[PDB]
RNA sequence: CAUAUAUCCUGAGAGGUGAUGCAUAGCCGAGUGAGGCGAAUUCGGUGAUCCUAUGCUGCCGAGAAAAGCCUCUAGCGAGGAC
RNA sequence: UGCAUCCGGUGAAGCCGCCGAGUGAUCGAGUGGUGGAGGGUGUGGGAGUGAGAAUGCAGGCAUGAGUAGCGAUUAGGCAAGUGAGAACCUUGCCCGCCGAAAGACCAAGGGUUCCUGGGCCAGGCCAGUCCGCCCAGGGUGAGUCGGGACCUAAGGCGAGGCCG
RNA sequence: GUCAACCGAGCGUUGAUCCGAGGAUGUCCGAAUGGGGAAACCCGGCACGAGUGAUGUCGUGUCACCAGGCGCUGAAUAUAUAGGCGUCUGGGGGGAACGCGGGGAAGUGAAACAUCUCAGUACCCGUAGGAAGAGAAAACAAAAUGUGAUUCCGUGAGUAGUGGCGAGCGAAAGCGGAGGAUGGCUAAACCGUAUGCAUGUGAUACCGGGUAGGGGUUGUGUGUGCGGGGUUGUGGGACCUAUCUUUCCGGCUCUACCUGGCUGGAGGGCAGUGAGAAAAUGUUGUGGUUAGCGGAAAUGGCUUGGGAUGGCCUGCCGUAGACGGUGAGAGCCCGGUACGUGAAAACCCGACGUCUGUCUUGAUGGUGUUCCCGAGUAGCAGCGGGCCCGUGGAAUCUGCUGUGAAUCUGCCGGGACCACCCGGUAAGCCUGAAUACUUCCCAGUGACCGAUAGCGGAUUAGUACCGUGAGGGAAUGGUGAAAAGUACCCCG
């Protein structure tokens, strides 16, 4: 069988100045599965943090082509999901900001 | 962490519950690692192995 | 020629020209003749590309038994 | 039955609203740049290669399709529209 | 290489020399140096067996030569700074150039070149504290934009099919 | 895991890492197959399930085309078919070489060139299999009481011959050998049964004789299927026929009656997963393969040396002195070697049997006539191909087109052809071994290369790079025994 936990889509959070500022604005950015979609992510986030999500915005980020003696090498093309919770939304603690 | 010997005692529903719990632990651990709040990095491999064992057991019960 | 169905006669290949023994290649295509074959059990006529030898033999054996052998081979 | 400054449609643009907002010339210190306050905002003129315009006129060389939209019924129909 | 012998970390080969030898290719179980591990001799066997030339091939290095050139038609300068180091980087003030462009925005194409921080033996036709260079990290948020999920043109693929 | 360390975490005799086998999972593309598509990315339908206040969303399955069966339906249109719907089974593509069948160059050589050669090469196409193909005489041979499937090897022989008789090409028989299965089935004629089609002294006609029913052992024909029966050349086989005649029982044998064939059961053989019919099933082989394990004998002395694996001297093992490693030439330090062990499971070979098939109502050997012995075939002609044979007197074989027979006193071949004689018995099928090859795997070898060599590739290798693309296509090895990889100070 397969268990479609919503936590398989949500891979990791993003830790950056921009992510922290958006956290102050109550907007949390995650690294999601590249084959996911906004509605899937909304449902997953809701089921995970027991919260209500206003919008979800996705940006696909190509991988950096880094060089080496062998030649060149490319990192992974990630997918970021920026998630605006609703007004109150009982915010998240798991980011360790 | 847990053994197949002691996973085969459990039921399908207990296994699925343990699977959900292990996926939750893995989620929390990925977040801890991203934030730097994880010393024990091997918990991730451990939990992935637990998930694999559980899926293996369930498929084994499905087939024979 | 159009590569018969009941008898499978395909073209032979060779080289034909004299007076210098040049031997430029050609083909010796069969006498394929469009024929509307009917099966008096079902009296409708389907257009086939068959050989003249096939026609002679199939007038010898009737359309029926040779059509049995033909459908047994499975060709259309 | 009518030839209608009738009616309908289309439609630039004007005006209103949007706008008690926003922005701004400038002013305060602050000097990394964080901010804060904030005047009047009427008249004309010129004037598009842009809009009305997928128009109008003229011409021959005689100028995409399909979706879409509208309508028709066939049909569905006991719930349905606004 | 077969066989038999011999030498060798008490220093083989290779390389550089000295002193010499042979009619010649060449020799040196004569010597030193360097070096560090396999070689010599005789007798046979077999050869990828000998290069100076092929406008030969590859590599390295010369000659020209510290020579030409250092890539437009705009033009740079002063002060101050930074720094080991400044014609070139930074700031300010001047001057000058474009101004249907040498401005601003897109497509195509490129693909991270963007931003921040750091660096400076390569690159930049000089130098370089600078950089489109190097390193690390970050960065691209769409119901309405451009596209798909709507439509078809040319044209393409083309169930079956026909023809071959 | 590693380049390739470092950091941080941990695991492990409760047996990790690692090795082998079997399984599970196995995104997306790709035959690619739900549909689309610029391959690896876009859009879905249906069913089930989850999730939502519901739409959205998620997951699991499934959904290509074609062929062949099976079932339903059966257009114009009536028969009916084409077709449509459903289901099931399969294919599709890749692969280094080898194979079979087809197609088929040119450079070149001929000192030109066209015939010819190159060459049936390269290339292409279609197809396979682990081998293939061929193969059980319508053969060879030459009068020998001959051989006796096929393939392959060597010879025959660079011969006979062929050839613008030029360049060149080039057999076969026969012989010696490999391997041996001189192997096995069938169609036909006759019966029997079933069935389709058309019909019916429709009864004196449907078993074998005679009686009686029966209204058909159809009056039948005719075609097909099935089963028998028959598979050959000294011709054989069938139909008739006659002598002998190895098992038992039952039911039919149109019907009951005596007597002639068939069909079931039983003892038994005979074979078998094979070409000769086909699967499954077990038990079981210190049989094998896929991990490995053990495995003798020097801390020997002296000396040199950084180090002994060198030298000198002592011993020792040896079914082990093979090859490597270890601080320099190590049998006795290590991995190992000789040698010997080892498989839970999977797989492959066997054996034993279940089981399957067949014979078993059977054969034996004889006598004289009709029937059969593979048909659009052979043969013939025309044009061609290939055979040594280049159309020549050109057989044999073979493609196309026409024409077109005979079934044994028949036909084919024995190098035009005729006669005789001999051999064989086409037009139907199958068939192992000897033979060819190596993408890949294992173990090994080299008077093979040893980094401009050897694979292009010891290294980032079909990479970087070049090119739109097909495609082309590099260079780059060595510290040292051990990083002990130069702390620290000085110039900078």
Curated annotation (Swiss-Prot), chain A:
GO cellular component terms listed in the entry, alphabetical order:
ribonucleoprotein complex; ribosome
Molecular function (GO) terms listed?
rRNA binding; structural constituent of ribosome
Q: Which GO terms describe its biological process?
A: translation
Presence of the UniProt keyword rRNA-binding in the record: yes
Keyword flag Flavoprotein: no
UniProt keyword terms in alphabetical order: Ribonucleoprotein, Ribosomal protein, RNA-binding, rRNA-binding
Q: Which domain of life is it from?
A: Bacteria
Recorded hits in Gene3D superfamilies, A to Z, give: 3.30.70.330
Quote the function comment for this protein. Answer: One of the early assembly proteins it binds 23S rRNA. One of the proteins that surrounds the polypeptide exit tunnel on the outside of the ribosome. Forms the main docking site for trigger factor binding to the ribosome.
**Family, as annotated:** Belongs to the universal ribosomal protein uL23 family.
Q: How does it assemble?
A: Part of the 50S ribosomal subunit. Contacts protein L29, and trigger factor when it is bound to the ribosome.
Question: What name is this protein filed under?
Answer: Large ribosomal subunit protein uL23
| The organism of origin for this protein | Mycolicibacterium smegmatis (strain ATCC 700084 / mc(2)155) (Mycobacterium smegmatis)
By which gene is this protein encoded?
A: rplW
Swiss-Prot record, chain B:
Give a yes or no for keyword Ribonucleoprotein in this entry. yes
Q: Which residues of the full protein are shown?
A: 4 to 67 of 77
Q: Which protein family is it in?
A: Belongs to the universal ribosomal protein uL29 family.
* Single GO biological process annotation from the record: translation
Q: Which GO terms describe its cellular component?
A: cytosolic large ribosomal subunit
| Alphabetical keyword list | Ribonucleoprotein, Ribosomal protein
**UniProt name for this protein:** Large ribosomal subunit protein uL29
Q: What terms describe the molecular function in GO for this protein?
A: structural constituent of ribosome
């Amino acid at each position: 069988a397969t268990i479609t936990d919503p936590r398989d889509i949500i891979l990791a959070p993003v830790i950056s100045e921009k992510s922290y500022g958006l956290i102050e604005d109550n907007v949390y950015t995650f690294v999601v599965h590249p084959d996911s979609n906004k509605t899937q992510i909304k449902i997953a986030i809701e089921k995970i943090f027991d919260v209500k999500v206003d919008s979800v915005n996705t940006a696909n980020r190509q991988g950096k082509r880094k060089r080496t003696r062998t030649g060149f090498g490319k990192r992974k093309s990630t997918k970021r999901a920026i998630v605006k919770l609703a007004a109150g939304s009982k915010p998240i603690d798991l980011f360790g900001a | 962490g847990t053994t197949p010997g002691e996973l085969r005692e459990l039921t399908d529903d207990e296994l699925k519950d343990k699977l959900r719990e292990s996926k939750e632990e893995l989620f929390n651990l990925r977040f801890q690692m991203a934030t730097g709040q994880l010393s024990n990095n091997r918990r991730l491999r451990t939990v992935r192995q637990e998930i694999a064992r559980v899926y293996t057991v369930l498929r084994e019960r499905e087939l024979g | 020629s159009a590569h018969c169905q009941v008898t499978g006669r395909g073209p032979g290949f060779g080289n034909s020209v004299s007076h210098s023994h040049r031997r430029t290649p050609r083909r010796w295509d069969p006498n394929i003749q469009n024929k509307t074959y009917y099966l008096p059990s079902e009296g409708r006529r389907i257009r086939l590309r068959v050989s003249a030898k096939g026609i002679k033999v199939i007038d010898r054996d009737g359309i029926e038994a040779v059509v049995a052998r033909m459908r047994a081979r499975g060709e259309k």
